UniProtKB/Swiss-Prot annotation:
This is Large ribosomal subunit protein uL30B. Belongs to the universal ribosomal protein uL30 family. It comes from Schizosaccharomyces pombe (strain 972 / ATCC 24843). It comes from the Eukaryota. It is found in: Cytoplasm; Nucleus, Nucleolus. Component of the ribosome, a large ribonucleoprotein complex responsible for the synthesis of proteins in the cell. The small ribosomal subunit (SSU) binds messenger RNAs (mRNAs) and translates the encoded message by selecting cognate aminoacyl-transfer RNA (tRNA) molecules. The large subunit (LSU) contains the ribosomal catalytic site termed the peptidyl transferase center (PTC), which catalyzes the formation of peptide bonds, thereby polymerizing the amino acids delivered by tRNAs into a polypeptide chain.
Length: 40
RNA sequence: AUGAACUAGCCCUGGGCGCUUAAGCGUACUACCCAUACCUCACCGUCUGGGUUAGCU
């Protein structure tokens, strides 16, 4: 009845989620580190 | 006050037009002119160093 979202797409989306999680965490701590660095 | 001997500089004698308290010579200081040089930018090419695939509307 419906198309089942190909398994290559599911594997990529899981991989992209891992990388997107890393990017946010890296930028989350970068902003705090940059603000302290600017004051120094 | 003069004269003598001297101290040097320049003159006399031995690119063009023109210039002569220079448009000459020497010194000092401002301003100004413009090379394919220098700086900024754009463009060409070469070289060099990267990035780019579960090929993500």
């Amino acid at each position: 009845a419906s198309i089942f979202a190909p398994e290559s797409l599911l594997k990529k989306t899981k991989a992209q989620k891992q990388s997107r999680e890393q990017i946010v965490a890296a930028a989350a701590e970068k902003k705090s580190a940059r603000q302290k660095k600017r004051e120094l």
